[PDB]
């Protein structure tokens, strides 16, 4: 997710030596991992039950 | 006289950051004179005998 920046003030004179100043984006990351692992278990007699 | 001249040019550049336009011009030249040719000064005051 990238967020939105802060304004600066307008200012020619210190423009001068700041024409080329980097400023980062602000980016923001999140992680999602796996989480369940499950089984059910059942048995059927089958004879037992016929 | 024996002037020459051998540059004249103009250049602009632009800051982005302070919105300005900065032009420089430049100028070059030869400037001389030749004693092959007859040159005389009328010279009032205390003058050399040679």
Known sequence: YTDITKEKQYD??????????????????????RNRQGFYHQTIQDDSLK | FMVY??????????????????????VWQTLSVSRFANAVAFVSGDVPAV
């Open chain 1, 12 to 33: 020619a004179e210190e423009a001068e030596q700041k024409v080329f100043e980097r400023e980062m984006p602000n980016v923001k990351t999140l992680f999602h991992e």
């Open chain 2, 5 to 26: 001249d051998n540059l004249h040019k103009m250049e602009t550049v632009r800051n982005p950051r302070g919105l300005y336009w900065n032009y420089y011009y430049h």
